[PDB]
Structures are given as C-alpha cells and as structure tokens.
C-alpha cells in the first residue's frame, strides 16, 4: 500500500535529522532532544487498516517508541500501538490486554492536559495506547493489524472518533538520542 502521508514535528531541541525518502521508507538521526515525531503514512486513518513495517534500523539511546501513531476527532484522541523502544516502556491505567501479530498488548489510559495537538497549542486529549509485552523483533517485516486494537479498546470504554485524523508508523522521542531506518506500506 502506497503511502500519502508524512510528519515531521519537533519541539525545536536537540536535533532530529529526519529524512523523506523513497516510498515508504523514511530515517531519523536524532541528538540531545526535547519531543519530536516523524511518520509516513496516510492522511485519514482507518480502523479497518493492516499497517506494513519494517525496522532495518533500531537503535535507541534511551527513551524511544516505535509505535504505530495517529490522530483522531470528536473527540481528540492520540493514540499507540507500540512494538518496541529503547530505555522506557510506556504505560498508564492498565484496562486488558489483546493478542495481535504475535504479540499480547497491554491496554492503557493517559490523559494530557497542557500539550501540543493536531489542533496545535496547549490543550487536553485522552490516549488510547496498545503496549507490548516484550519487545517486538526489529530487522523483518512486521504487521500491524488495528482493527484488533479498536475492537479491543471498544471493549474497554476507549471508543474513538467519528472523524479520522492522520496516522503513521512512527519513531518516538523525549529527550533522547538515537537512530531509526523503517519503511511502511
């Protein structure tokens, strides 16, 4: 699946040397940072969509994610499904779990008041997150299936939006340094 969308954000501190290449396929050099995301993609998310990854680069020096990440409506909501990551493990109100791909997810709830949104600014949304238990192997491909996800959050209150907002496999950031070379599709 060809993709159409591409993000690039950053807070402004440290460094992210994010580069759109080919395709799918994107990279990120990352040094001293503050909050940063970079993502290809598409431009409306879907529920009903199988997401196609492929980390040849994984390399964290300490607080990564690379998560499936996306965006939401009525009500804002931002939202995970994270396969891996470098130093920390994210986490929140632990709601259930949710076999898909291989792996068991842990479900969380967080809420952010006083921060950055597709709107902008600094405001509030929830976030619906997936958490895997292990670390999901980089290097292959890998597939994101999210109607699992959505199913599952929909049985734990976490319901979504009517209006769909971008979403994109992801390499998060805070204050870190590190290095991701994946490609999507």
Same mark, same amino acid.
């Given at each position: 699946?060809?993709?159409?969308?591409?993000?690039? =954000?950053?807070?402004?501190?440290?460094?992210?040397?994010?580069?759109? #290449?080919?395709? &799918?396929? *994107?990279?990120?050099? =990352?040094?001293?940072?503050?909050?940063?995301?970079?993502?290809?993609?598409?431009?409306?998310?879907?529920?009903?969509?199988?997401?196609?990854?492929?980390?040849?680069?994984?390399?964290?020096?300490?607080?990564?994610?690379?998560? !499936?990440? #996306?965006?939401? @409506?009525?009500? !804002? /909501?931002?939202?995970?499904?994270?396969?891996?990551?470098?130093?920390?493990?994210?986490?929140?109100?632990?709601?259930?779990?949710?076999?898909?791909?291989?792996?068991?997810?842990? /479900? *969380?709830?967080?809420?952010? *008041?006083?921060?950055?949104? /597709?709107?902008?600014?600094?405001?509030?949304?929830?976030?619906? =997150? +997936?958490? @895997?238990?292990?670390?999901?192997?980089?290097? %292959?491909?890998?597939?994101?299936?999210?109607?699992?996800?959505?199913?599952?959050?929909?049985?734990?209150? $976490?319901? !979504?939006? +009517?209006?769909?907002?971008?979403?994109? $496999?992801?390499?998060? &950031?805070?204050?870190?340094? &590190? %290095?991701?070379?994946?490609?999507?599709?």
């Amino acid at each position: 699946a060809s993709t159409d969308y591409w993000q690039n =954000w950053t807070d402004g501190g440290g460094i992210v040397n994010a580069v759109n #290449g080919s395709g &799918g396929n *994107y990279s990120v050099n =990352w040094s001293n940072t503050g909050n940063f995301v970079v993502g290809k993609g598409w431009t409306t998310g879907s529920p009903f969509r199988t997401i196609n990854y492929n980390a040849g680069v994984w390399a964290p020096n300490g607080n990564g994610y690379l998560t !499936l990440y #996306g965006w939401t @409506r009525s009500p !804002l /909501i931002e939202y995970y499904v994270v396969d891996s990551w470098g130093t920390y493990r994210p986490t929140g109100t632990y709601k259930g779990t949710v076999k898909s791909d291989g792996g068991t997810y842990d /479900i *969380y709830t967080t809420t952010r *008041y006083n921060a950055p949104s /597709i709107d902008g600014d600094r405001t509030t949304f929830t976030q619906y =997150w +997936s958490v @895997r238990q292990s670390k999901r192997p980089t290097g %292959s491909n890998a597939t994101i299936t999210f109607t699992n996800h959505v199913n599952a959050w929909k049985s734990h209150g $976490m319901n !979504l939006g +009517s209006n769909w907002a971008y979403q994109v $496999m992801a390499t998060h &950031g805070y204050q870190s340094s &590190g %290095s991701s070379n994946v490609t999507v599709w």
